[PDB]
Amino acid sequence: PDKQVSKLQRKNKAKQLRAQRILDSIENRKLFEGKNGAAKIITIVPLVNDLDPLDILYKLLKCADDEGIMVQEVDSKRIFNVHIKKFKSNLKIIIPDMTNFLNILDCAKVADFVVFGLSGVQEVDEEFGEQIIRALELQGIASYIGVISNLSAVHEKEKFQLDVKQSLESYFKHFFPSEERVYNLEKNSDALNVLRTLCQRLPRSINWRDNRGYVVADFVDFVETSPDSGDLVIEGTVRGIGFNANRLVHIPDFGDFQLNKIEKITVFESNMNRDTLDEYAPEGTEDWSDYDEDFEYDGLTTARYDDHGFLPGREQTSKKAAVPKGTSDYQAKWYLDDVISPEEEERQLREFRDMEKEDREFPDEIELEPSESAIERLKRYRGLKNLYNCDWQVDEKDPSSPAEWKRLLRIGNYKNTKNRIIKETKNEAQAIAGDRIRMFIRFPKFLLEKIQDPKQLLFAVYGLLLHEHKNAVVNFSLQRWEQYDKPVPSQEPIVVQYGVRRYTIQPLFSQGSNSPNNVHKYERFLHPDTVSVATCIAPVDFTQSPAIFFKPSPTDAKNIELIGHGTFLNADHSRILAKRAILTGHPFRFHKTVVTVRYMFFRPEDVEWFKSIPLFTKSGRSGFIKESLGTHGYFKATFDGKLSAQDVVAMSLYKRMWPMPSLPWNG
RNA sequence: UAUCUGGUUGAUCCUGCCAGUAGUCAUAUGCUUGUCUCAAAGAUUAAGCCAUGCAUGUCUAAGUAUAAGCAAUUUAUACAGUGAAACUGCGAAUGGCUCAUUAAAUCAGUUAUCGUUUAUUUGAUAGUUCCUUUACUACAUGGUAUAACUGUGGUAAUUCUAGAGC
RNA sequence: UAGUGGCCUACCAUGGUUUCAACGGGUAACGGGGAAUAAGGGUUCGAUUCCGGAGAGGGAGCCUGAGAAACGGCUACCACAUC
RNA sequence: GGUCUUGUAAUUGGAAUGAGUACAAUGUAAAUACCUUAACGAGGAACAAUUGGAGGGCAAGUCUGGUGCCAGCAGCCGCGGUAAUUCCAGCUCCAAUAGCGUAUAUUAAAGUUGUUGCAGUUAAAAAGCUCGUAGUUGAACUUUGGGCCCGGUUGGCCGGUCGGAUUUCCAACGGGGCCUUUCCUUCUGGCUAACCAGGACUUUUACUUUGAAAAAAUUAGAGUGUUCAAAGCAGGCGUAUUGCUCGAAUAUAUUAGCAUGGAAUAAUAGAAUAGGACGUUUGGUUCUAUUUUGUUGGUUUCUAGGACCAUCGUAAUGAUUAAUAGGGACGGUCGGGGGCAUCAGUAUUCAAUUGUCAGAGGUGAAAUUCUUGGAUUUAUUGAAGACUAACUACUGCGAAAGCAUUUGCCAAGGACGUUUUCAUUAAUCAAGAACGAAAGUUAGGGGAUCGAAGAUGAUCAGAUACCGUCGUAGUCUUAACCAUAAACUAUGCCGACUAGGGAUCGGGUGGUGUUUUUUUAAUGACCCACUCGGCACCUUACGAGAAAUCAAAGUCUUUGGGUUCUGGGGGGAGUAUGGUCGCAAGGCUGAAACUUAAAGGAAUUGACGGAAGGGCACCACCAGGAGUGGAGCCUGCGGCUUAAUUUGACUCAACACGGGG
RNA sequence: GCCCUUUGUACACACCGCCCGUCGCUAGUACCGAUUGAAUGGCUUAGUGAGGCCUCAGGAUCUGCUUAGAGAUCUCAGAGCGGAGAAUUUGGACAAACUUGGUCAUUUAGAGGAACUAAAAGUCGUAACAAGGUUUCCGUAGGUGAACCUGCGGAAGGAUCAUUA
């Protein structure tokens, strides 16, 4: 009735809205504050091979003076549940050795608090230290609270000595600047400021890290529950986004498996409504029957340019014999018409990095020697008009389709199923994270080489989803790694991480421009600056991580050869390709209307039958071939202006190659 | 130091808005950052919530010493120089912070108290006190009550305190 | 009451304020010198080192005392919240 | 010939230094630093100043590459479609400089808040017109001119001081003592009015002038070498011989409050009864004790100090005006002014009689109706309404809406004349109240006229749907509303003046003034003059306005005669919402959310026409000739076919084939 | 047909229905909210009202003076009276607060409606089909696919050369 929203001195009654803000500051104090399933992973990895965190646990905590001193033990615990008697919390500090580079980047999904070890003794190395900066950094640092752990650096000068601290406080801020000062080991309350940082200072969050169900791997077992399965008694402080009884369990480096009964020490089984233990979709073989494009390659008259162009020129072959002797180009048809390895990194490094321009400028040029044939090589695919305007498709019916392309979970869209896939975990989230859990995880006897008991070593365990058991086809966004100048050809197996886990996938990089129509290329090779878009089949981990593509070798002081970082863009079937061609025209003279071009067509059936190709200049002057006669190849057309011997009278082969699957590398 | 400029029309003669510009003991903030003297600095936005430590206690010739406490006894058997604790007195109503309230309220300038209280400070001020000073008197000075001292204890824990003897 | 007084209280009178704006409402309102100004006037701000007022999270209430409706004083309620 | 320089000069040339490290001690409660201080650390690679721009506002290239709508660039406009000054870069340059940007907020320019100091004819804005209260203002009058001197200040011929007035001649700026009715008072001890007590003022508020209160800190400024400063109120000087000694101003802060003149302005009015002042007067009323009485209290007077009746002696005994401001009376006019009856008109259509004997009706073509039981052009009598047609305008009036023929009736008004009466009774206007076109709203009268809607005929495509015919209500009135107009002269109402005019109409006057005839200028009307009322016009525009135009849309930047209501860019929007007034329809008051670089005013210059004139052309037309138009081929191409069956623009095209048979 | 051109006089580009509109979908947000949860309160209706302070009282107790029970400054019942005086209870007024009614609400959580918004995409009508109005108003009354039209009043914000004694 009355629009009477005035008299708002009881706008102060709407400090009720601050009460919601009070409610905003209550339910987030549920999972992180206590002892019963509230102890946090803090992994201390210095940037320096010295500083050796047995004194960082001890000589730093000589100001705390509770008995984390007493268990600061040569029997390296790594589950340090010392209840420190002033801020009331059990703890966990992972102290890894400096070399085991395989889980430091992998255990960091539960690991909230990350602490660099900063030293002016060793210069932070451009392959060890600065690249551990780039490795811990570009996975997404959950919380970076820097500590100068230097005991032997407080007397390297006596004459305003504080440059040993300023050079490190700025070095925390040259890449990851969210600390102001970095603390000396000579003030008192800075050691229980660590426990303030654990208890009262809540950590901040990574986008991709906190989207799933992720668990802790304290201990495992060797059980016999099948001819080839067992069980796992895992102590795990779960911090996931909300588990479900429908979910599956994930042993990284080995496989994808299933439980027996989810319990607490309330029984939740591995119930019937599940995807049975496939990897490619089992309905995919039957999905190799949606004959969307039966584009038979040699049983046509016209390419798919119907959709305003050609009336088709029919060549109805009705040959008649040529009886008398001696024949030129002309007289045959009017004879008797009864009309009724480091060396090849210098040998083949000449070409296998400089053939990267064979992709760019002459992609599918039919190249022309008098021995090379024009018909056979680039034969068996369409030739539409323009990549920003044409029409290429998803699922033809050919043998060119690989194994987990025609046996796919054909991913609909990524963006229109990320709401499904994530909201399968948003809504169907039943088993409560935050607690402790004793689960009978069925554990196969096959994969019992490298599953260990980490009180001193490094391993972790992850979770799965319902339809993450199925797999799909991905299309990455990649940038070149910084200060990594040398290119790599892009039809080659690169070990893809999108996140942390490793797969030697065989991608297809294409240009990462702003694409209106979402139509791509089969670009063979790379570009040294801009964004690349990979295209491959991967067995899919659907949470948009900063992707790391590398070479599987312990080459540098890093145990990786970092090739390039980028973005897990999507997993999409209709994100489709079209490889270009640019043919050649070299104008032999300087004409007015009809330009006599040579160096264009050698053979007569390569002259005559290849007169159905659209003539376009490199300047873009499109058009069609009306005639041609050249042998050592002319034409006769009509363009905007005139032509010159440095022009390119190009022609169109717009062809479509087909993608390549992955390889799971773990070693 | 009483400056204005660009935008409607094809244009001689021609109105009202917008944008630019300059200050800010206005804030915030980007980039850069070497000296000298300075120097604000948790108001808004939460008159919202707090670990921890500190911020108010105090004694001189001149209120109460048997510390068993000590220094030298050296000037003394009544005491006498120092002096813990404790009684007593004064202080703790000043300072410091914050600005939510509050619109004839506060406050500001001017009034008034012939209508009122005032530790302190400063100045002045009790022959009549046995109310019979015709006395049951001790004014050569009359009584209790107690802390600390002590020595037996309980409390999960508080600057909790109990029982007796001084 | 320290004291004037509708400050109450007991009987009386029917008054008092106002379009010279009563009363009611809002204030991102603590009031006074300051600031940005700069032909002059006008404009907007003033939590803030000084003066005065108010409060010790919000309302009550009382002791000691010359002085407090005191909170690094006390009792109770209300909102919190420690071992 | 280079004494001197502008830079090219990277060839120089040694000397020279701080930020930074340091003994040293000061420095400080203890330390840092900072004035101090020896040792050590510079050459351009040194020990290197960044930040924003580079199309206009807005300095600074149309330099060169990649870029040619592809991004770009844009606070507002403006470019790039390929000659980009405006794109990515390379240069290079421009500013401010350990400092430059950016975001919002305010101030300024911003006469876009206007008291100073806007704007309403058309650009947003004057309302429908009167009556009216609060408020805001409000007509004119009250002691001039001159003498006696005092000389505070200046002119300088004086110069006697040689930057200055002291003997001082000529005039000039000031207030006082006093005076030409200029009362400037009375009241007397100090007293013989200089000034101090004493009784009244030639009235009280509004106004203003000088004090006082206005905390210190801020704002303005001596002085001070804190090294200048920002600061700070500090400090300076010798024989340092044992000390000497300057300071730490003032300016400011209205109302309100408290003291005194000033003598206008506005206010308030005396003395219209003269029951009043000058009453220095007299019986009588309230009186009376500082008293003297005799020391102190019941009983008294004369008596110091006020008032009036009986009562009259006193000087000059009280009526500021009749307004080119209003209100009355009375007078002749005036009168399509308004109102109440009567009343006439050309006739109108409707109704009848009567006369009649086969078409009219519209529109651009057409389509809708009456009648041999009588059409329509004839002849005669009524109901209703309308308006008084022409005379009807350089009109006359009325608050506005409005009103045009007579006669009687009813007041007022307007004008004009007056040597009549009120003597400021006054202007507008919050609130409040009358009236109110057309239309519309309830209850009635007629029901003649046409006629929003509607019922019919239309009638062909949208030459365009303008046509035509009947029509409830309505138009006309009665008892009442409504409260709307381009209700507009697009201009609120009372003031001031100016132009310049020939007429008007309402009044007033009569020329040795001209004619019918009261008898040269009578009834009436005139030429020449003159006055105030209403309606108008056009000039040069002095003044404006931006401009059309305006004698007021003036006397406004040379800004203020009084008062009332509106407007702040366009929209959104007179929309929502709420408060009202009505039975209603609607009327009165009135936003935001959002979006914009515009909306708007008057004014002008000449392309294109679906405007065509004349020419004048037989490279076009009529009279026909030659003759195509049906065909074989030279001569010349577009089409098939090619290793080859080549090729293109000028009078510019359907052509020359480019001497190419 | 074009020259001398005249002249409507820019159309200074004279105004309007009039052309990316329907069905079935993609998402984004206006809004209301027929509905219960709040969330705490303005206002006030009602029954309770902690608490200290003052009073009507009460009197654990310890005491003392004096007459006191017993020995030359003696307690073994005291007895009046006096002093201080810790519980409980009367009343008072001050009174934070509970138990409540409607109401105004807000920020809100479901709950359901009509919608609009984008280059929005298959769609046949006005994409993909062609013309027509070409006095402008104001008040007011009516019809309206539309500027327009009609009724009564009004206006110019509209284009007057000539004959006159």
PDB file of C-alpha atoms (C1' of nucleotides) in Angstrom, chain B residues 116-121, chain C residues 2 66-67:
ATOM      1  C1'   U B 116      22.599  27.571  47.907  1.00  0.00           C
ATOM      2  C1'   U B 117      26.864  23.730  49.493  1.00  0.00           C
ATOM      3  C1'   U B 118      32.121  24.157  49.526  1.00  0.00           C
ATOM      4  C1'   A B 119      37.771  19.070  51.819  1.00  0.00           C
ATOM      5  C1'   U B 120      41.824  22.128  50.763  1.00  0.00           C
ATOM      6  C1'   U B 121      44.632  26.824  51.070  1.00  0.00           C
TER       7        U B 121
ATOM      8  C1'   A C   2      22.522  22.473  50.014  1.00  0.00           C
ATOM      9  C1'   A C  66      33.925  18.167  50.817  1.00  0.00           C
ATOM     10  C1'   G C  67      33.246  16.250  46.173  1.00  0.00           C
TER      11        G C  67
END
